[PDB]
Amino acid sequence: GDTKEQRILRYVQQNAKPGDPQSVLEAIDTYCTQKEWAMNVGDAKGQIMDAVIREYSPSLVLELGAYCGYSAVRMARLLQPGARLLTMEINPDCAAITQQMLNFAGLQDKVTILNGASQDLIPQLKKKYDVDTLDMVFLDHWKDRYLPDTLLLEECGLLRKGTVLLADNVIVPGTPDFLAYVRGSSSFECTHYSSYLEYMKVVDGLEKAIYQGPSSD
Ligand SMILES: COc1ccc(Cc2cc(-c3sc(C)nc3C)[nH]n2)cc1
Ligand SMILES: [K+]
Ligand SMILES: [K+]
Ligand SMILES: [K+]
Structure with a gap:
């Protein structure tokens, strides 16, 4: 085979x-x-x-x-x-x-x-692959995992102010949990790029979410 x-x-x-x-x-x-x-x-x-x-x-x-x-x-x-x-x-x-x-x-x-699996590997990145911070993340895996892996990166300290998340398929079939969070959180500065796969009926898009760093006061 x-x-x-x-x-x-x-x-x-x-x-x-x-x-x-x-x-x-x-x-x-x-x-x-x-x-x-x-x-x-x-x-x-x-x-x-x-x-x-x-x-x-x-x-x-x-x-x-x-x-x-x-x-x-x-x-x-x-x-x-x-x-x-x-x-x-x-x-x-x-x-x-x-x-x-x-x-x-x-x-x-x-x-x-x-x-x-991303939720196993992301925690090992610092210790086992000598990652300090990521400069850019492209998400194109399981849709239900976009939002939790994002906070997993966040918690692991792999994002710095200026880190660019680019998420694929946020529209078709959609990642509505993930979109709502980065669009609503103060920790991201988002921009949507539309991809026209088929006229009128299949219009997808990537979300570019720029990490803004932890707050300060
Ligand atoms: C529609 O279902 C699919 C969507 C995307 C893919 C491609 C893919 C996803 C992954 C995953 S999933 C996970 C927890 N960690 C990783 C690295 N590796 N490769 C496969 C199936
Ligand atoms: K550089
Ligand atoms: K894709
Ligand atoms: K926002």
């Missing part, structure tokens, strides 16, 4: 230019349109991601929900020399795919992959 992630990686390895992230991203994009399937972010959302990374130029990025490494290849190619991406994947096999995917893209020295 051959899973379909294995087939995407086998397509990349066969049709993309080694060491060239853009070529890798286009091979995956092309396999998806032909074999009718899709990664966790599309092109429109990629461009939103691209702008955020370019605007804030983060030295340390956490991604929750790697899948194939498509989004890791997307973000890590924009990282400056010295900057690194930590990405979490809960499914062992997908995590493995993501590593092979990064290896082939040449971005493997910038990205560390962690196989595990």
Whole structure:
């Protein structure tokens, strides 16, 4: 048997230019349109991601929900020399795919992959991976986990004033708990970027929530 992630990686390895992230991203994009399937972010959302990374130029990025490494290849190619991406994947096999995917893209020295569940890994980040603070967090895992993982980062001390949270799919299927909190909390300064997946009927969006640091008085 051959899973379909294995087939995407086998397509990349066969049709993309080694060491060239853009070529890798286009091979995956092309396999998806032909074999009718899709990664966790599309092109429109990629461009939103691209702008955020370019605007804030983060030295340390956490991604929750790697899948194939498509989004890791997307973000890590924009990282400056010295900057690194930590990405979490809960499914062992997908995590493995993501590593092979990064290896082939040449971005493997910038990205560390962690196989595990976010609520187990986030607490170990300081002690076991020498994280002080995160500069940017991309959330694209389980919807019910967005709001509690956010406060888990908060409690663990992994956010500093200026940390940028970028949450995917806050509209479709929606993360209404998470949205309400960052939009209502004084600890965040939010902005919504809309992604038009289909005219009138499928209109999603990412939420960019800027941590404002603990209060003072
Ligand atoms: C619709 O359901 C899904 C939504 C997103 C994904 C991709 C994914 C999510 C994760 C999780 S979940 C968790 C507590 N920690 C992590 C790192 N790893 N990979 C898989 C299924
Ligand atoms: K997504
Ligand atoms: K920086
Ligand atoms: K707010």
